[PDB]
Amino acid sequence: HXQGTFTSDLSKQKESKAAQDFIEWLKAG
Amino acid sequence: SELDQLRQEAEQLKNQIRDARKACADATLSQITNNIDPVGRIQMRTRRTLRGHLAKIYAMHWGTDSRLLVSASQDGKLIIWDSYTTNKVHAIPLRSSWVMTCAYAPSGNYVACGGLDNICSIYNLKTREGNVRVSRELAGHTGYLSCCRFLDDNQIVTSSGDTTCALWDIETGQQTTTFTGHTGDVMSLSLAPDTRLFVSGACDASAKLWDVREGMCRQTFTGHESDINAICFFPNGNAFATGSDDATCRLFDLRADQELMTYSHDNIICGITSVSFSKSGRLLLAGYDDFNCNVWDALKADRAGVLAGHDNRVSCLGVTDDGMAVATGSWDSFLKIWN
Amino acid sequence: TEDQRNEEKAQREANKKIEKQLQKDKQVYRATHRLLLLGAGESGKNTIVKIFETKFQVDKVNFHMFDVGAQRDERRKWIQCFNDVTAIIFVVASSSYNMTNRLQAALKLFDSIWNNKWLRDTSVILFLNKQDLLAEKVLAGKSKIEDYFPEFARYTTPEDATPEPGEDPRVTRAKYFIRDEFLRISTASGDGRHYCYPHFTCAVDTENIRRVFNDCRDIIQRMHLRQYELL
Amino acid sequence: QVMDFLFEKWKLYGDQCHHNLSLLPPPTELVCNRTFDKYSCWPDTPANTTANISCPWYLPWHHKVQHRFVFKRCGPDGQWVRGPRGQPWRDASQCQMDGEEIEVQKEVAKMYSSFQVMYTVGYSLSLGALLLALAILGGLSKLHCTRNAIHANLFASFVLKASSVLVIDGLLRTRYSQKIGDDLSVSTWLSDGAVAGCRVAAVFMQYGIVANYCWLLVEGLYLHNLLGLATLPERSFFSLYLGIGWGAPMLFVVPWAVVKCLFENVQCWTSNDNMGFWWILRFPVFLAILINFFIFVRIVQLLVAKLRARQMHHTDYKFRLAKSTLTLIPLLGVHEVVFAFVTDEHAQGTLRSAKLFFDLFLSSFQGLLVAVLYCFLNKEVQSELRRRWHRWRLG
Amino acid sequence: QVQLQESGGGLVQPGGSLRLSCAASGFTFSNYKMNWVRQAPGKGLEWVSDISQSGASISYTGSVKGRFTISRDNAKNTLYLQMNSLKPEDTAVYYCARCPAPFTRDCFDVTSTTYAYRGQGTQVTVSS
Amino acid sequence: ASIAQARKLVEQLKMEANIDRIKVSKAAADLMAYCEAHAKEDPLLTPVPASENPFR
Ligand SMILES: *C(=O)CC[C@H](NC(=O)CCCCCCCCCCCCCCC)C(=O)O
């Protein structure tokens, strides 16, 4: 289960990337 | 000094008979038929598939009702199928696993088998008990049994690998006559529609015609250049075709003592395993060693059709008495039917 | 009109019983090995167990050793039946030329069996029987193998050929020569579909049936590997 | 879990200050009144006061970004600066994230985007061929053979997986690449939305991964059990094999589904935390890899015996053959290489990335390799296809 | 009607040379592998030599290898076996035999008793 | 036993000589192609319609 590890890691990625993206809107708007 | 001169006699006679049959050979057959309209393209499809056997199917036979057919395989089974509904009726076991022939009685009451066991086992289907067992065990041959055909519910004629065909009597259990005269193994035989005389091909490129009443040989036809595998009469009883291993089929005539047509083609290089005529006799169906069986024209000697489908070698080829369907068993435990 | 449904039900029940019996005896037909046994003649095939069918069992494996000693000597027709057989056992009598040169006839018969159209997929077990009688065939000097074979004089025993403890180097040499003649025929033609398994018969039969079983297992394993496109 | 764990603090902090704005008014026009800065409330700093006030805790990771402050100035009768288009701008850049990581982020991403593109090609490419292989296999003369049916059912397990993992990322891509700027969008997406579809596609994807490994295991077992016995198999045991495959993964995937649904729920279950709860989906994998690698070495241990037994006329020509088969047989297990030792745990740095790349690549092109090796290079199917084309190209 | 005639032979001084000619008529001579089978008086039949369809594959029995030669001429439908350096124990009757299956590399014609496709033969003796 | 097998061959060929061969044309189309008026009932020459065909 390699593919599972990859998707887990990418899930962490799109999430944390969205966290900063969210915070950036909050900072502005 | 007898043998030396004895050969000459034969030789002399041979040349005389050669002359006679080639003298009366004015025309061919093609010529006398060039005028007929050819049958054209003929297409067939497998209508039913009978997947019940385990080992290769080596012989089958249609019943007189053109509805029930019996099949024999090397696994030791003799399955009686049903053409219309694809339902096995009796899967009777056999003692000898190496069965080489099977037959169906004209009245639908008995079936017969036979192989390397040198015994023509005859089975009764109308047992009051219900379950079908063997009734009479005929054992009078030394070589193997290659083909057997019923005349009626009382007497059966069998070919053998000991160069001797014989006529049996079920009630007594001994050979009535003995058709000695062949030099090689006898492969197949067919009965005339009037059941008064029959032909029998062998492994010496000769198809001797016998007379069951007199128990002697009347006409001997030579022409093939290798051992003969299967034969069958024309529907009128005045002719019969022979399929040999030289990749040629030949039709002969019982009143001209000479071959009339050669069904040879360049692409086919393998021998013929089985042959059978159609209802009207216009279509000759032969089974080849190249995994498929062709459909030749009995007068134009042109492939009017090819019936593929079988994976391994075909071994048996039966046409219904009414000509409605054609069945083809092979060495893949399958029985395709065609219309 | 209920006659149609009830007769159809009866026919279906009969067909179901036929299918059940066919499955039941197909389950046992696939597990029993068949073995054709043929030879030139006067070979001594009665010692295998010590009107022609016989069977035996080793290691919970069934065998059917089909003798054909009742037919004629024209084998070109009834041998086509033995194409689904697992292994054609071919026992040879290399010391039965005293009453003919049976070795050449056996070689020709083996070559015909090997190169047949329908026997391509059938492997052959080879048994160099009557091996003990080879020793007296050379000391007396009445008939010489070199007389009937010109390549025997220029023959050397193989380096990997293990000598039997207690055998004159000449017997071993002659027996390995004959083995190689059969093996040359064996490998000259196409051999990707079947293989030959030469053997030397001994005085006891407890090892012969084990050899046959081991060779049949090898044949089955090779067939299974060939089905998977390995070799 | 970061997303949902920051929604709360938006509200939590946004209310503590509302109580700090309460009990606080003092000067209103002389000195700036109590104001509210959207994302961040603080007691209003007076006219030009010392900026000793730090930027809010807010952001959870503030424990490493503490020692930096925020500068706010009450200018025109207590007013903050307006900007380019008059928007109030605050120079809170010193409280922001550390560029460094941001860079590394840019990095990993790229690499992960390349891996995605490179594994999506792989699946899709072998997803096509698998189908073409199933269609040709299940409609011909060999449509029902005991060895061939297992291959057809494995090609199904491969199609199921490829399809499973190509749809679980579709959701993922689509559930993060929506414009989440407008208050509504962000607030709602991080919350319960179509997490239903995602959740069930995740269970349905994990089932597929494990079923693929189980059908590789049963493929090995059938070959191992077909060589030990001397005779042919009297019973195909086909029922047994369709339960070691298809069925058994359930006995391992269902307890996972429940352990997530009950103990550890997260946005979409793709994100894997609690490594103990991932061992229940990895133990079958490790078992089906080890106990099939054992029979892989066992098969070669006798394949070398058969190649050296006879046919020794081509002395040392077995080399090519032994190799060709040894690279045709791994249709079952290869992972071993960067597996075992390297687990998800204790695998960091570039090693992890190399493992992921190697394994992903092999797992994405496995299906294509298997389909090519067992439905396009087999001599039986080649000869049959020829026959069925010859018979059509007759008249 | 197949017909194999074996001309030649007769009485020869041990060490002489005889050319046996086999005449065939009734089949396509080019399609069959043709063999020579001899039978000494006192024992059974034995295969001597053979030849392939085109004449490439040629084999001999070890007892007569090198001394005897075999050749076929497809255009004349004839088989030639030329004898050289005869020996006293070569007294036998020589049958020209053919194989039963065309375009096949294996066949079973060594059969002594009753094989159809074999000629009457020509019995040869060595001088005394 | 040369005479025993020689008499079998010489007798046979005596009986192979007395048979009267009725030409070849008289037994060509004159009977074989004459057995053609009943080719209309042959179910293979003229494919019968599926209605009254038992193997539809
Ligand atoms: C996270 O929001 C976005 C993720 C997104 N990923 C990608 O764009 C990569 C996914 C794969 C791209 C599509 C490749 C299709 C390959 C088809 C090959 C067909 C077979 C070839 C033979 C004809 C991102 O933007 O990073």
Q: Checking DSSP bridges between strand C123-129 and strand C87-93, what pairing results, if any?
A: parallel
Question: Would you give the DSSP letter of residue C24?
Answer: H
Is there a contact between D284 and D249 (Cβ–Cβ < 8 Å)? yes
Question: Would you give the DSSP letter of residue D244?
Answer: I
Count of beta carbons in the 10 Å neighbourhood of residue F20: 9
Is there a contact between B306 and B326 (Cβ–Cβ < 8 Å)? no
Residue D40 CB contacts under 8 Å (≥ 6 apart), including other chains: D13, D17, D55, D56, D58
Assess whether chains D and F touch, using the rule of 3 or more C-beta pairs within 8 angstroms. Answer: no
Closest by alpha carbon to C48, among C36, C56, C40, C58? C56
Sheet with B239-244, strands from edge to edge, namely: B228-233, B239-244, B249-253, B258-262
Burial of A5 (0-12, 13-18, 19+ CB in 10 A): buried
In angstroms, what is the span from residue D118 Cα to ligand 1's centroid? 8
Give per-residue burial for B183-206: e unless 16+ CB within 10 Å, then b: ebbbbbbbbbeebebbbbbbbbbb
Count of beta carbons in the 10 Å neighbourhood of residue B258: 19
Cα-based angle B73, B77, B79 (whole degrees, multiple of 5): 90
Sheet with B69-73, strands from edge to edge, namely: B57-62, B69-73, B77-80, B90-93
What gap in Å lies between CA B187 and CA B231, rounded to an integer? Answer: 9
Considering only the beta carbons, identify the residue of D141, D394, D395 that sits closest to B311: D141
Is there a contact between B202 and C77 (Cβ–Cβ < 8 Å)? no
Helix or strand holding residue E94 (H, E): strand E92-98
Residue E116 CB contacts under 8 Å (≥ 6 apart), including other chains: B183, B184, B203, B204, B205, E2
Considering only the beta carbons, identify the residue of E63, E104, E111 that sits closest to C74: E111
Please report the atom of ligand 1 found closest to the CA of residue D176. 2
Residue with token string 């053409």: B83
Architecture of domain B2-338: 7 Propeller (2.130)
Alpha carbon of C174: minimum distance to chain B alpha carbons (Å): 38
Distances from the Cα of D112 to the Cαs of A13, A14, B19, D126, in angstroms? Answer: 9, 11, 94, 21
Q: Checking DSSP bridges between strand C32-39 and strand C87-93, what pairing results, if any?
A: parallel
In chain D, helix, strand, coil percent, each to 5? Answer: 60, 0, 35
What gap in Å lies between CA D1 and CA A18, rounded to an integer? Answer: 12
The total domain count for chain E is 1
DSSP states along F6-42: HHHHHHHHHHTTSS----SSTTTTTTTTTTTGGGSS-
What gap in Å lies between CA D131 and CA B285, rounded to an integer? Answer: 41
Q: Checking DSSP bridges between strand C32-39 and strand C61-67, what pairing results, if any?
A: parallel
Backbone dihedral angles phi then psi of residue D185, each to the nearest 5 degrees: -45, -60
Considering only the beta carbons, identify the residue of B183, B245, B271 that sits closest to E116: B183
Residue E104: its chain C contacts at CB < 8 A? Answer: 117
Residue D281 CB contacts under 8 Å (≥ 6 apart), including other chains: A1, A4, D206, D209, D210, D252, D253, D256
The total domain count for chain D is 1
The Cα diameter of chain F in Å comes to 67
Closest by alpha carbon to B191, among B174, B209, B179? B209
CA atoms within 13 A on the CB side of C176: 17
Closest by alpha carbon to C108, among C30, C181, C160? C181
Cα-based angle B149, B151, B154 (whole degrees, multiple of 5): 110
Extract the tokens encoding D2: 């970061």
DSSP states along D158-211: HHHHHHHHHHHHHHHHHTTSS---SHHHHHHHSSSSSHHHHHHHHHHHHHHHHH
Extract the tokens encoding D361: 């690549």
β-pair partners for B49: B336
What gap in Å lies between CA D101 and CA D109, rounded to an integer? Answer: 12
Residue D149 CB contacts under 8 Å (≥ 6 apart), including other chains: D238
Distances from the Cα of B141 to the Cαs of B110, B136, B215, in angstroms? Answer: 21, 15, 17
Smallest CA separation from ligand 1 atom 2, residue: D173
8 Å CB contact of B185 and C71 = no
Alpha carbon of A19: minimum distance to chain D alpha carbons (Å): 6
Is there a contact between E46 and E100 (Cβ–Cβ < 8 Å)? no
What gap in Å lies between CA D282 and CA D199, rounded to an integer? Answer: 19
Residue C108 CB contacts under 8 Å (≥ 6 apart), including other chains: E47, E110
What gap in Å lies between CA C76 and CA E114, rounded to an integer? Answer: 13
Give resolution, Å, one decimal: 2.8
DSSP states along B263-314: ---SS--S-EEEEEE-SSSSEEEEEESSSSEEEEETTT--EEEEE---SS-E
* C61 and chain D in contact, CB less than 8 A: yes
Q: Checking DSSP bridges between strand B239-244 and strand E69-73, what pairing results, if any?
A: unpaired
Handedness of CA B140, B144, B150, B151 (dihedral sign): negative
**Within a domain: D12:** no
Site residues for ligand 1, CB cut-off 6 Å: A 14; D 113, 116-117, 120-121, 124-125, 173, 176-177
What gap in Å lies between CA B200 and CA A16, rounded to an integer? Answer: 92
8 Å CB contact of B162 and C72 = yes
Is there a contact between B76 and B117 (Cβ–Cβ < 8 Å)? no
Residue with token string 């010109």: C150
Residue of C nearest to E40 (CA): C100
The approach used to solve this structure was cryo-EM
What's D247's domain CATH number?
Answer: 1.20.1070.10
8 Å CB contact of E104 and C104 = no
Extract the tokens encoding E45: 């039949």
Is there a contact between B200 and B243 (Cβ–Cβ < 8 Å)? no
Is there a contact between C43 and C97 (Cβ–Cβ < 8 Å)? no
B/D interface, count of CB pairs below 8 Å: 4
Considering only the beta carbons, identify the residue of D223, D231, D310 that sits closest to C33: D231
* Cα dihedral: C29, C31, C36, C37 (round 10): -130
Residue C29, SS3 per DSSP: helix
What gap in Å lies between CA B242 and CA B204, rounded to an integer? Answer: 13
Residue span of the structural domain in which E25 resides: 3-126
Smallest CA separation from ligand 1 atom 1, residue: D173
Closest by alpha carbon to C186, among C139, C122, C129, C135? C122
Alpha carbon of F51: minimum distance to chain B alpha carbons (Å): 13
What gap in Å lies between CA B71 and CA B335, rounded to an integer? Answer: 9
Amino acid at D118: M
Residue with token string 């080399």: D319
* Cα dihedral: C81, C83, C87, C88 (round 10): 50
Closest by alpha carbon to A21, among D190, D38, D117? D190
The total domain count for chain F is 1
In angstroms, what is the span from residue D120 Cα to ligand 1's centroid? 6
Is there a contact between E87 and E72 (Cβ–Cβ < 8 Å)? no
Closest by alpha carbon to B170, among B140, B199, B147? B140
Residue D61, SS3 per DSSP: helix
What gap in Å lies between CA C17 and CA A8, rounded to an integer? Answer: 56
Is there a contact between E38 and E112 (Cβ–Cβ < 8 Å)? no
Closest by alpha carbon to A15, among D276, D110, D96, D180? D180
Question: Would you give the DSSP letter of residue B220?
Answer: E
What own/partner pairs with CB < 8 Å and gap ≥ 24 does A8-12 have?
A: A8/D270, A8/D271, A8/D272, A8/D344, A9/D112, A9/D356, A10/D112, A10/D116, A10/D169, A10/D172, A10/D270, A11/D172, A11/D268, A11/D270, A11/D271, A11/D272, A12/D271
What gap in Å lies between CA D52 and CA C160, rounded to an integer? Answer: 95
What gap in Å lies between CA D212 and CA A2, rounded to an integer? Answer: 13
* Dihedral class, residue B40 (left if φ above 0, else alpha if ψ from -120 to 50, else beta): left
Extract the tokens encoding D248: 């058994």
Q: At what angle do helices D318-326 and D283-309 cross, to 10 degrees?
A: 160
What's E99's domain CATH number?
Answer: 2.60.40.10
Residues of C contacting chain B (CB within 8 angstroms): 11-12, 14-15, 18-19, 21-22, 25-26, 29, 66, 68, 70-72, 74, 77-78, 81, 84, 118
β-pair partners for B206: B222
Sheet with B134-138, strands from edge to edge, namely: B99-104, B110-115, B120-124, B134-138
What gap in Å lies between CA F53 and CA B322, rounded to an integer? Answer: 12
CA B266 to chain CA mean position, Å: 25
* Dihedral class, residue B100 (left if φ above 0, else alpha if ψ from -120 to 50, else beta): alpha
Distances from the Cα of C77 to the Cαs of B208, B245, B246, B287, C72, in angstroms? Answer: 19, 12, 15, 17, 10
Is there a contact between D371 and D133 (Cβ–Cβ < 8 Å)? yes
Smallest CA separation from ligand 1 atom 11, residue: D117
What gap in Å lies between CA B192 and CA D88, rounded to an integer? Answer: 114
Distances from the Cα of D146 to the Cαs of C76, D149, D237, in angstroms? Answer: 35, 5, 9
Amino acid at D17: C
β-pair partners for C58: C61
Distances from the Cα of B245 to the Cαs of B205, B268, B332, D28, in angstroms? Answer: 10, 11, 21, 119
Closest by alpha carbon to B158, among B172, B171, D156, B142? B142
Closest by alpha carbon to C227, among D226, B291, D291, F44? D226
Q: Checking DSSP bridges between strand B120-124 and strand B175-179, what pairing results, if any?
A: unpaired
Residue D329 CB contacts under 8 Å (≥ 6 apart), including other chains: C230, D296, D299, D300
Extract the tokens encoding B8: 């000459």
What gap in Å lies between CA E8 and CA E122, rounded to an integer? Answer: 7
Is there a contact between D136 and D125 (Cβ–Cβ < 8 Å)? no
Report the number of secondary-structure helices (H) and strands (E) in chain E.
Answer: 0, 10
What gap in Å lies between CA D385 and CA D142, rounded to an integer? Answer: 11
Residue F48 CB contacts under 8 Å (≥ 6 apart), including other chains: none
Distances from the Cα of D164 to the Cαs of A11, B291, D207, D282, D367, in angstroms? Answer: 16, 44, 9, 18, 14
Residue with token string 């994302």: D39
Burial of D236 (0-12, 13-18, 19+ CB in 10 A): middle
* C31 and chain D in contact, CB less than 8 A: yes
Sheet with B216-222, strands from edge to edge, namely: B186-191, B197-202, B206-211, B216-222
